[PDB]
Structure formats: C-alpha cells, structure tokens
Amino acid sequence: MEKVREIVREGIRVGNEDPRRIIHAFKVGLALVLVSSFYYYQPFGPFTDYFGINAMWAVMTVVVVFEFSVGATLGKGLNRGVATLVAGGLGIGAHQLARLSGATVEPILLVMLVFVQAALSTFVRFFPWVKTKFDYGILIFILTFALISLSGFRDEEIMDLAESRLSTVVIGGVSCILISIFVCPVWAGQDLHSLLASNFDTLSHFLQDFGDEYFEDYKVVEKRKKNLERYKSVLDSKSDEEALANYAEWEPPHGQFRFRHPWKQYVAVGALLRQCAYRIDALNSYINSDFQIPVDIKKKLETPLRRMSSESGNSMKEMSISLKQMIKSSSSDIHVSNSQAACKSLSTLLKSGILNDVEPLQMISLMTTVSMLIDIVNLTEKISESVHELASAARFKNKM
Amino acid sequence: MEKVREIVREGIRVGNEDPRRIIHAFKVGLALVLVSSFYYYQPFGPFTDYFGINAMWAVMTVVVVFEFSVGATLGKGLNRGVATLVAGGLGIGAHQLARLSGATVEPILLVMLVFVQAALSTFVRFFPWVKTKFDYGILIFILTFALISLSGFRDEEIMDLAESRLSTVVIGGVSCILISIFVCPVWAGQDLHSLLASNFDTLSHFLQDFGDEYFEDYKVVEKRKKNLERYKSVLDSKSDEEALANYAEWEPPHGQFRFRHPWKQYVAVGALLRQCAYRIDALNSYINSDFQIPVDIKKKLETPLRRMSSESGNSMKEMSISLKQMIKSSSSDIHVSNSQAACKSLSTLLKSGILNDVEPLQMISLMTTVSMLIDIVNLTEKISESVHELASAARFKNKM
Numbered sequence: 099m100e101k102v103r104e105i106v107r108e109g110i111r112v113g114n115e116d117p118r119r120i121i122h123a124f125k126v127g128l129a130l131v132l133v134s135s136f137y138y139y140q141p142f143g144p145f146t147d148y149f150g151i152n153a154m155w156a157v158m159t160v161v162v163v164f165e166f167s168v169g170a171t172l173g174k175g176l177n178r179g180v181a182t183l184v185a186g187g188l189g190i191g192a193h194q195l196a197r198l199s200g201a202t203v204e205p206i207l208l209v210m211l212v213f214v215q216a217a218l219s220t221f222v223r224f225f226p227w228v229k230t231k232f233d234y235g236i237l238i239f240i241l242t243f244a245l246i247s248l249s250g251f252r253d254e255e256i257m258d259l260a261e262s263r264l265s266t267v268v269i270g271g272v273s274c275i276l277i278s279i280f281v282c283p284v285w286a287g288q289d290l291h292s293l294l295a296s297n298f299d300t301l302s303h304f305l306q307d308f309g310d311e312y313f314e315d316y317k318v319v320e321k322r323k324k325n326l327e328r329y330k331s332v333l334d335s336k337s338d339e340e341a342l343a344n345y346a347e348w349e350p351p352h353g354q355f356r357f358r359h360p361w362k363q364y365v366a367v368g369a370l371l372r373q374c375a376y377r378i379d380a381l382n383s384y385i386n387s388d389f390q391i392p393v394d395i396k397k398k399l400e401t402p403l404r405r406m407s408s409e410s411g412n413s414m415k416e417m418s419i420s421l422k423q424m425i426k427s428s429s430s431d432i433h434v435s436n437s438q439a440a441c442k443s444l445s446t447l448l449k450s451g452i453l454n455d456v457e458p459l460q461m462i463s464l465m466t467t468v469s470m471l472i473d474i475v476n477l478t479e480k481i482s483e484s485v486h487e488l489a490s491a492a493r494f495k496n497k498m
Numbered sequence: 499m500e501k502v503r504e505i506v507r508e509g510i511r512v513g514n515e516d517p518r519r520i521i522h523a524f525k526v527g528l529a530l531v532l533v534s535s536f537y538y539y540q541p542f543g544p545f546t547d548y549f550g551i552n553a554m555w556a557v558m559t560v561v562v563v564f565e566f567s568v569g570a571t572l573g574k575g576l577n578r579g580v581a582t583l584v585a586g587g588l589g590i591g592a593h594q595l596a597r598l599s600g601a602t603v604e605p606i607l608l609v610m611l612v613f614v615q616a617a618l619s620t621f622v623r624f625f626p627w628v629k630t631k632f633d634y635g636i637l638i639f640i641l642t643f644a645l646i647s648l649s650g651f652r653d654e655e656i657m658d659l660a661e662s663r664l665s666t667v668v669i670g671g672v673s674c675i676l677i678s679i680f681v682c683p684v685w686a687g688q689d690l691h692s693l694l695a696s697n698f699d700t701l702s703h704f705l706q707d708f709g710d711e712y713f714e715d716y717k718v719v720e721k722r723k724k725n726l727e728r729y730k731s732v733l734d735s736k737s738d739e740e741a742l743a744n745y746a747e748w749e750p751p752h753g754q755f756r757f758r759h760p761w762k763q764y765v766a767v768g769a770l771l772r773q774c775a776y777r778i779d780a781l782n783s784y785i786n787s788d789f790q791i792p793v794d795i796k797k798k799l800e801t802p803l804r805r806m807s808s809e810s811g812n813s814m815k816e817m818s819i820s821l822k823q824m825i826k827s828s829s830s831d832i833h834v835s836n837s838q839a840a841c842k843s844l845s846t847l848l849k850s851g852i853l854n855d856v857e858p859l860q861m862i863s864l865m866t867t868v869s870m871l872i873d874i875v876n877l878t879e880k881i882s883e884s885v886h887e888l889a890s891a892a893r894f895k896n897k898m
Binding site: 109111123128135150154162183214218224225243249250336376383404451453461462463473 | 512521523524526531536557561562608620624644648649734736773780783845849861862872
C-alpha cells in the first residue's frame with residue numbers, strides 16, 4: 099500500500115511537470131480506436147483480406163510508430179513505409195528466383211539469400227549516417243525481407259502477402275501521422291527552442307546569484323543546491339538537443355518555421371552555451387572550495403566583477419526571451435556593449451597596482467576568478483552575435 | 499560510380515575500426531538460419547501450429563531482439579518475454595470478460611478496455627525509472643494486449659493465439675541469447691572498462707603534449723587538431739558510458755566480473771574524468787587564444803608546471819592500464835605523491851616574490867594557467883583514490 103502512495107505521487111509529479119504527456123496518452127488510445135474501428139466497419143471497400151491478420155498488423159504499426167513529437171512519428175512512419183516497400187519488391191524478386199531454382203533446392207537458396215542480405219544490412223547499420231537518421235529503416239528492411247522469404251508460405255501467397263503488408267503499414271502510419279499533426283501537435287522544433295531558452299535562463303540565474311554570493315543550517319544546503327543543479331542541468335543536455343534536432347528535421351513547415359530552417363546552427367548555439375557552462379562550473383567549484391580569501395580583498399575588486407557578471411546575466415536573459423517567444427529583439431547588444439565597457443574599466447583599474455598588498459596565493463584565486471568572468475563575457479558576446487544573426491536571417495518578428 | 503567508391507571506403511574504415519562488427523553481422527544471419535531451420539525440420543515435436551504464422555513471429559522476434567552487446571540482447575529478450583506473458587494473461591482475462599458481456603456489446607467493451615490500458619501504459623512510459631530500464635517492456639505490453647484484443651479473431655482462437663505468441667517469443671529470444679553468449683561474446687562490461695581506459699589515455703596524451711607545447715604551415719593545423727579533438731571526445735561521452743552501464747547491469751557473471759559489480763561507481767569515475775576534461779578545455783582555449791605572453795615570463799615558472807603536468811599525465815596513464823587489463827596496480831600512488839610535492843614546491847617558489855616584474859594582465863593569464871594545473875592535480879588525486887579503492891574492493895589481480 100505504501101508503494102501505491104509512492105507510485106501515485108510520482109504519477110502526479112510527472113503529470114504536473116508536462117500535461118502534454120497526458121494528452122499524448124489519450125492520443126495513443128484514440129489512434130488505436132480509430133484504426134480498429136476502420137477495420138471493423140468496412141467503410142467503402144472491404145479488402146480481399148486473404149490472410150485475416152490485417153487488423154493485427156495495423157494495430158501493431160500504430161503502437162510502434164506513434165511517438166511523442168510530430169517529427170518522431172513522421173520519421174518512424176516514413177522509415178517503416180519506405181523500408182516495407184523496398185523489402186517487398188526484393189522479397190517478390192528473390193522468391194521468384196528461388197522458385198525458378200527448383201522444388202527442393204528452394205529453401206536452401208531462400209535461406210542463403212536471407213543470410214546474405216541480413217548480414218549486409220546488419221553491417222550497414224553501423225555507419226554514422228545511417229545510424230543517426232535511418233536505423234529503423236534498415237531494421238524494417240531486414241524484418242520485411244525475412245517475413246516474405248523465411249515464412250513457410252506457398253509460392254502464390256507471396257504476391258498477396260507483401261501487398262497486404264504494405265497496405266496495412268501505409269494505413270497505420272497515415273492514421274498515426276494525421277492524429278499526431280491535427281489533434282494537439284507537439285512539435286520538436288518548438289521544444290528545441292524552449293530547451294535552449296531554459297538553458298539560457300539557468301545560466302543567467304547563476305550569474306546574478308554568483309555576483310551576489312561571491313562577497314558573503316539547512317538553508318545553506320538549499321543555496322548550495324540552487325547554485326549546483328541549476329547549471330549542472332546544462333552540462334547534461336547535449337543528447338537531448340541532438341535528439342530534438344533530428345526529430346525537428348522531419349516536420350513539415352508549420353506556422354513560423356519556413357521550409358529550410360537551420361537546425362544545425364541552433365545545436366551550435368547550444369554547444370557554445372555548454373562552453374559557458376564549463377567555465378561556470380569552474381567558478382562554482384571555486385565558490386564551494388575550502389580555501390576562502392578574506393572578504394575585503396574581494397571587496398577591493400567588487401565593482402567591475404559585479405558589473406561584468408550582472409551585465410552578462412541580463413544579456414543571457416534577453417537571449418532567452420528572443421529564443422523562446424521567437425520575437426526578434428536587440429537589447430542583448432546594449433547588454434554586451436556595457437559588458438565590454440566593464441572589462442575595459444577593469445583593465446584600467448588593474449593598471450593602478452591596487453594588487454600590491456595581497457599574498458600570491460590569494461592572487462592565484464582572485465586572478466582565476468577575474469579571468470573566468472572575462473572569458474564568460476567574451477563567450478556571451480559570441481553567442482549574442484550568433485543568435486542575433488540567426489534570427490535576423492530567419493525572419494522572426496523583427497517588429498520589436 | 500563515385501558514390502560506390504565513397505560508400506565502399508566508408509565500409510572499409512568502419513570494418514577496420516572494429517571487426518567485432520563484422521562478426522556480429524554474421525551472428526545475425528546465423529540466428530535467422532538457426533530459427534528458420536528449427537521451424538522447417540520439426541525436430542522432436544511438431545507443434546499444433548493452428549494459425550500458420552509461428553515462423554513469422556519467430557523470425558521477427560530474432561530480428562528485433564538481437565543487438566550488439568550481450569546485455570543488450572538479454573535485456574530486449576527478457577523484456578519481450580515477460581511483457582508477452584503478462585499481456586497474454588490480461589488479454590485472456592479481458593476477452594473472457596467481454597464475451598461474458600454479450601454478443602453485440604462485445605466489441606464496444608473490448609475497444610474501451612484497450613483504450614484504457616493503452617492510455618495508462620503510454621503515460622507510465624514517461625516515468626524516469628521505467629524509461630531508463632523497461633521502456634521496451636511497456637511497448638510490448640501494449641503490443642500484445644492490443645494483439646489479443648483488437649484482432650478480429652473468434653472467441654475460441656484466443657487461448658491458442660496467446661499461447662502460440664508466448665511460445666514463439668520464448669524460442670526466438672532463447673536462440674538469440676544463446677548465440678550471442680556462446681559464439682563470440684561482446685560484453686558491455688568490458689566495453690565500459692575499455693571506454694574509460696581510452697578516455698584516461700586521451701587526457702594523459704593532452705597533459706604531456708601541453709607540458710611541451712605551452713613553452714614554444716599545414717603541420718600547425720595537425721598539431722592544433724591533435725590538441726583539440728583528443729580531449730573533445732571525452733566531453734561528448736556521457737551518454738555512451740550511461741548506455742554501456744545499463745547494458746552491463748543485465749549480463750550474467752562472466753570470467754572476472756562477479757555477481758554484484760558496482761557499475762554506478764564506474765560511471766561516477768567517468769564523471770570525474772569529464773570534470774578534468776572541463777579544466778583541460780579551458781587550458782586548451784588558453785593555448786589557442788590570441789593574447790600570448792612572451793616566452794620568458796613562462797620560462798621563469800617552467801619547472802614546477804612541467805613537473806605537475808607530466809606527473810599527473812603519467813598517473814592517468816597508469817590508471818588507464820589498471821582499468822583496461824583489470825590488473826590491480828599501485829604506481830598511481832607514487833605518481834600522485836610526487837605531484838603533491840611539485841605543487842608544494844611551486845607554492846614555496848611563489849612565496850619568493852619572483853612575480854614582481856610582470857604586467858598585471860600577463861599575471862592574469864599566468865595565474866589562471868597555474869590554477870588550472872593545480873586543479874587538475876587535485877582532481878587526479880581524487881580519481882586515483884576512487885579507482886584504487888574500487889579495484890581493491892572488487893578483487894582484481896592484486897598480484898601485480
């Protein structure tokens with residue numbers, strides 16, 4: 099009974115985290131009901147249905163194809179469709195060849211052919227291109243060829259078997275795609291934009307909180323987590339962006355995403371973000387570290403460091419907005435220009451020999467922190483140029 | 499014809515990179531031949547085979563289940579088996595209920611039941627636990643329940659259909675597992691140990707080459723790549739280690755890996771490595787950067803930095819050996835003790851005010867580099883303690 103409480107609480111938090119999960123749970127059931135009802139009531143034409151398993155293969159197609167996003171289901175559906183078509187052609191051809199062979203040398207030749215093409219296809223599944231894009235395609239290639247060949251079906255129930263398999267795959271896939279596109283879409287493109295916006299948000303949060311924390315029982319652990327996990331979720335989000343990009347390259351042009359949309363460049367912006375997160379990780383590890391300088395030595399450099407940190411944080415916040423709501427903004431320009439001014443003023447302040455009363459070890463720590471903030475400022479300028487150009491050249495809402 | 503050259507060259511390099519890929523390509527074909535031949539020649543008992551599709555489902559099971567590793571195929575096979583068993587029980591029960599309902603209210607109740615359980619299962623597929631371990635299990639749960647229910651099969655061909663599906667899944671899965679275990683195994687545990695060893699190797703390479711490069715037309719780009727990509731492959735290897743760990747938790751106890759083996763701790767060691775790679779990334783970005791100090795200011799600190807870098811590099815090399823060949827070694831202890839001695843001597847050298855003739859900006863760059871090397875030394879000590887304990891407490895070849 100205790101596990102009932104635990105599991106229903108995990109269910110509650112999963113549902114509250116993203117309600118589109120609940121609507122997708124209903125969409126799967128709607129697809130199953132739709133296909134099954136299509137095959138029960140023969141709507142306009144009762145197919146030949148010589149085998150009696152059409153409903154089986156259609157329900158299995160719908161269950162395996164229907165994924166969360168729209169690009170995911172469209173990719174799986176298109177892979178399954180094309181692979182079934184090609185493997186059906188080769189299955190009919192190979193079976194005609196083996197029937198031309200003889201009557202007893204027929205299973206030997208069929209088994210040899212299945213062995214050859216399954217070996218070649220399993221080896222091709224290791225290539226980088228085919229793996230990143232069309233791995234399910236090669237899987238269904240092997241599946242359908244081995245279906246049409248290695249199944250103990252007669253020589254005249256093959257032209258009908260492949261045709262029925264293709265028809266059923268087409269119907270299940272089309273049902274899946276139409277429901278997933280027209281009911282309550284979950285586009286992978288929007289999810290990528292929103293993931294990048296969330297990452298920008300967490301980095302800006304850390305930068306402001308750091309600017310205020312560098313110069314200062316269970317609440318301590320609360321603050322420590324608020325510093326750690328917030329950025330630590332950016333470092334572990336490369337596979338997620340690389341997945342959403344792949345899923346996004348399949349979708350059709352919906353509202354504000356034209357035909358040719360540069361997803362590779364958005365993954366590049368994500369990589370630049372992750373570089374900023376490397377540097378921020380080093381900064382945090384310098385916050386938590388044991389060896390702590392007295393406060394006044396940091397207070398003598400407080401002003402430029404605080405200005406640099408806060409300005410880069412605000413610039414990342416504005417990039418977050420301009421990536422989420424897809425509205426072309428240009429305030430990051432001002433927020434990065436003032437950052438450059440702060441870095442220059444810090445250089446001129448260091449030229450004054452103010453650091454001639456400090457132990458060399460404290461000099462190591464202090465100079466490391468200054469160098470970190472300078473690096474994050476420059477990287478923020480790079481990301482701002484990248485996003486500004488990527489939006490200007492992609493026709494966002496330039497109206498401001 | 500040009501694409502023929504290109505594709506056969508990619509095939510050659512993929513084969514030469516890892517020949518176990520070729521042997522696995524042959525293993526898939528051997529599994530298909532084995533199962534098909536088992537179903538053609540009825541070996542000891544010709545099953546009832548009331549539907550005529552047993553060979554289809556067995557070949558499809560083998561094609562979908564058989565993966566590269568041994569843990570991968572064992573996981574997919576066990577998930578498919580258990581999910582088919584449970585969903586078969588529920589399918590028979592639900593169908594008995596719906597037959598008890600009536601004769602015309604039967605399809606309505608069956609469709610409602612399929613909708614309910616497909617919705618609940620699709621929602622459960624989003625949990626973190628079920629997603630990381632048993633997602634294919636829930637997929638086959640939905641598949642088999644919808645097979646037994648939504649297929650237009652009569653009321654008495656259901657007790658036989660589920661039984662035949664379970665039998666066929668069992669035979670295909672057992673064939674896959676036995677071939678994958680007894681022919682030429684590809685253990686995911688060994689692949690994880692070897693991946694960690696490769697990562698350690700690349701980091702040691704960078705540390706030595708950096709120790710020699712910090713103090714110095716197309717060969718320049720060669721050296722630049724040799725610095726960049728070597729460590730840049732460590733940053734992008736979190737999903738791979740996290741995959742091989744999951745695959746490794748399924749395998750049975752083979753030669754030197756006992757029953758309870760701590761894979762979570764090895765993924766933790768991988769994470770520590772990736773922290774060292776963050777710091778190394780900052781170091782490399784300081785190498786390539788435009789603002790370059792004259793050489794003599796670095797030469798005045800050459801000795802301790804060179805000693806620290808080379809000692810930590812050798813220590814990482816010995817950890818690589820002790821992780822690859824699974825032999826318990828303790829030379830990293832000496833190689834980290836001398837590192838601590840170098841760091842202490844560097845502190846005493848800095849206490850001498852030797853840095854009183856240098857511009858503060860050059861001070862920023864120099865002190866940042868010194869702080870980086872100190873951080874990597876300490877992190878190497880942490881990883882060495884972790885691996886030394888993880889090996890001592892797991893009974894490696896302590897004989898040295």
